[PDB]
Amino acid sequence: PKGNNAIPHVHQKKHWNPCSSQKGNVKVFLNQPAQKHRRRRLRLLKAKKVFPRPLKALRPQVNCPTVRHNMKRRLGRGFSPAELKAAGLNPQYAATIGIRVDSRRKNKSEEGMNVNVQRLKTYMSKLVLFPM
Amino acid sequence: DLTGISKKSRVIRHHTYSTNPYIKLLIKLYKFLAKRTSSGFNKVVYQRLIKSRSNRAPISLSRIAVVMKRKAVFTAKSKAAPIAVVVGDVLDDVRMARIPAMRVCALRFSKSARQSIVAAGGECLTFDQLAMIAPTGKNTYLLRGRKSGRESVRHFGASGVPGSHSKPYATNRGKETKRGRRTGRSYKRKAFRHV
Amino acid sequence: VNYPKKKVMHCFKVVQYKAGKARLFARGKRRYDRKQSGYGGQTKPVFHKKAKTTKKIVLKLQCSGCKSIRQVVLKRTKHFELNDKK
């Protein structure tokens, strides 16, 4: 019988089994080792194509939002118009020399942009940009 | 020959189901000692080895300290420090900052429990190294370590029976506290009943 | 059964609780308005079989001191009057 078992709640009542009648709706990761090799092969092959450029662009520090994460820093996409203006670079010209640009961030605390404005002029120091 | 004596047979666990090759050495060590000695210790420390892994509950250094302080308060005050033997394994205790220089003999130690002993001033032993010091186990304080409060033992029960403060098997902790566990849902599991 | 209009209390006006307003916008009826809406059957059961003919009497001992209505509940009586002991 039953008895002193946890009420199951298994949630497998929607034809997920790829039987003879149903096409099945399961995602088995039998290809993730092929894909890890697949991506690192594109990655290492895209890197020698973009060379001498860095494969990854430059991303700023941003604060993870909620009270659970607000003390954890993170790399967000693009900087802002603000850091770029407070570091000289035109956000049209920053977005073409590897710097990633985000016209949506709002620089709510000066604290925030100060870490990133200075983070630009580190890059803008150790970047050659040899002309064409 | 009518008997009735059919169910009086107790399950004693003759051997160990462990496959650890370093405990089958301690077991052959403590069959020799437990058999060809008049030691009460060696008898007892042998059934505790062949015993299973869920039944050899770990004692924290806290438990070892306090009970070795309850021994060392009534001694000759210069006689000796008995050896705290536990046939489970010893775990560190971050609630005990200062630990005495006590000798301990466990099948295992945490990496933080071995350093806490050796930093304290004591030396943690083994059982091939305690068969050299009191093999009969004179001056050894044998210990189990609490196996109640274990989450397995507090699901044991029904939890819907009056006077059953057991925990229902429920992943969702906020699933079953409704009807049957409320005084205003036509009955409340009676928290007390004489048994 | 009879019952007195007045009961003295040391701790008083009797009304014989007869509520039943049956609000709209009650959470179980908003659901119902949503749940039995449109197609499908009468998407809920309904007490069809007969009933307990006699009904239990809630009795609201509203203190003549302003506030804090009490409720006592009597037994199941067919005829209930507050005649108050003629």
Added chain:
Amino acid sequence: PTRFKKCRHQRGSTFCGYGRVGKHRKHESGRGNAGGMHHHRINFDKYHPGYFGKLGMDHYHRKKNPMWKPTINLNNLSRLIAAEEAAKATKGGTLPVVDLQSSGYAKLLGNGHIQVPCIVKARYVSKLADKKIRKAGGAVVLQA
């Protein structure tokens, strides 16, 4: 492992352990958790006492981030000061400076007597916690 099975162990038993009178059927005691109030009510009322009801008010959009308050006790503070970081807690008379949220542990609960004097910086702190630390050579500091 399929050889480690009992219907592979009990070949030739003709029933694989399900009997001759009550034959092993398909779903025969309902299917699923069916009958929790009808015919398995004795199982549910007795191993699942609180199932089958309603309780409390609804919190519609529940977000576990704003309702996030992990807790550490006073006897577990030593879990955040390495012996080296506590080696400076020996010399110079410099109390340890513990900062909870960096290790998790928003709230600081007061359990036991604090082994080592320190100054914790926690978002939240209990009344008895706020008092054991400030009377053990220490100080709670509220952050965020």
Added chain:
Amino acid sequence: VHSYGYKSGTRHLFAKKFRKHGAPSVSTILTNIKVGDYVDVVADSAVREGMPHKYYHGRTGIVWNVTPRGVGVIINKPVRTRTLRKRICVRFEHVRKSRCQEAFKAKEHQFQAYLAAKKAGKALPPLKKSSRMGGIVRPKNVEVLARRV
């Protein structure tokens, strides 16, 4: 199974005995009970307020509780494969102070007081004599037996 009320099949059980009816004793009101003594839970009628269930009538057991006018008695009840120590709550009149130990209350009272008298005491007064042995018995009336019809 038409009727199984709290007082079923109990005509002769709660019925008072012949020519002894009416109010309970003044002894039964002047009894003295502690937590621990034994009591015969002999439910009498004519009080009809506090009688236990039928089952607990020939039953005796510890008093675990003495309220102002209700004695609480534990009673062993062999339910099916185990006995429950039931905890009944009755009034005092449904209760006797159970003799069931005078068998050795009064035994060891004089048995020790003479074992002491036999071990140390002051002196050893001779006690009850032997019971079963032989003997050259002298008869006092002969007889025979054949029939009586």
Added chain:
Amino acid sequence: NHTNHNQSSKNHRNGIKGPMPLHLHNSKRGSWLPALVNARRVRKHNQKAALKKRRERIAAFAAKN
């Protein structure tokens, strides 16, 4: 079909276990309060005494050893 047959012999296989003695579950609880509220306060004192009696012991057993 009520039978009661085989039941008395089922109750005596694993035996009709005897009752627990009085020192088991002797919770003087749910009983008459003015007793247990006094058998409570006298337990508190008798515990302050049990703790105190061990305090001299160890301290007598120290100096007198």
Added chain:
RNA sequence: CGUAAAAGCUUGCUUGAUUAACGAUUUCCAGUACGAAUCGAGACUGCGAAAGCAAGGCCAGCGAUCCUUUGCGAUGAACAAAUCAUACCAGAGGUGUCAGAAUAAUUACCACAGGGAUAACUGGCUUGUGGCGGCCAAGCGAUA
């Protein structure tokens, strides 16, 4: 069953037929509800000079989840306010199939799964019915 200076009768004064912090228990029992009881505690009380008695009329007379509903005095989650809703709490509306689906037929045109767990059938069994017989005949006619 029980009761006789009452538990019945008459009168008096009354609401203890109330809140009960509900604590425990009994019966049903799985020692789970429920229902009804028992022993209590805290008030506040009534009746008594008092001890005491009373938390109905003993013991049958009753009802879960959800919903509705009233009483009773935290939330609606960017903040604030009032409504509105919900929540906790205690009750009521009720499930008589009374541990609680929301319910009419007919099938000989019928179909299926099975069942000798169960009828017609058949094998028995039942020995009283229905029909046959014995001794004894008030006497019939003591018997053709």
Added chain:
RNA sequence: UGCAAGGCCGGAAAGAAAUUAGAGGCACCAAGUGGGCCUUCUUCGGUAAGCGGAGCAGGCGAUGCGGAAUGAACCGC
């Protein structure tokens, strides 16, 4: 004050209720079973039954062997 009472307690106590003393106590997990039948004793219903419903114990089921020629149940075992 001290009796008595509870929670205690130390000083002290031994037996001049038979037997087995075929070890007590819990705990966990899990089946199968939830159609029984016969029988002894007694006994409710029925004209009766190789009948229906019970109480007790024993059986059969789930079990042979031995013999009542023969028999799930009887007698031995």
Added chain:
RNA sequence: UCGAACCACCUAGUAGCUGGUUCACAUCGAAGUUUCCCUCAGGAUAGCUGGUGCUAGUAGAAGUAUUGUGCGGUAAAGC
């Protein structure tokens, strides 16, 4: 093929119902009962039973007697 055709599909539809379910030996070994169920061809829950045990256990042992000590209203009896 018709009281709803035929083909393919949903579909391996569901079945508390019927049939079957593949080696050996060893160690033990039952139940047809309790309560609840639109329940009475089924379940759930106890009991029975197995395995693993834990534990200081001639004891908190007993289908037994003795001893005291209660209880009862059937047989017989008596109208």
Added chain:
RNA sequence: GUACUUCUCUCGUACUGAAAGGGAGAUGCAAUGCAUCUGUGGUGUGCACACGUCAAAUCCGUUUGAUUUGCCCAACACC
């Protein structure tokens, strides 16, 4: 496949309340203060204690004190 991995998450070390929320060391003085280690009693391995006991000899079976480990029962405190 193997090897490495900060980061994070996950389970849990803390529970509770419907919710706002809150949130468990012990002892002495107190009704918060100060030194700041089993929490109480009970049932309780092992060893050390002395205690004698046909005891080959003297090591162990007997046992009584000590601490009692686990466990259980009772009732403290605290959330």
Added chain:
RNA sequence: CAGUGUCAAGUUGGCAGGUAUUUGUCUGCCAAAGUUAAAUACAGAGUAGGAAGACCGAUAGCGAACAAGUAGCGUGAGCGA
């Protein structure tokens, strides 16, 4: 979201801020136009090329190891060795 009825406003704004309503504030955002790689799904055209396997081993593995969707069946949809 749809359908019908209704049908706006204008940055003194509009929508979103998971409980309805009104009154306020605050925060984000700017619908009713449009394009946009990659990471993601798929072995179907194996198209092109393949590589593998604790798989099956001819009653198995695809229905099909072979002149297999063939012979043969069905009025036909289809069935199918």
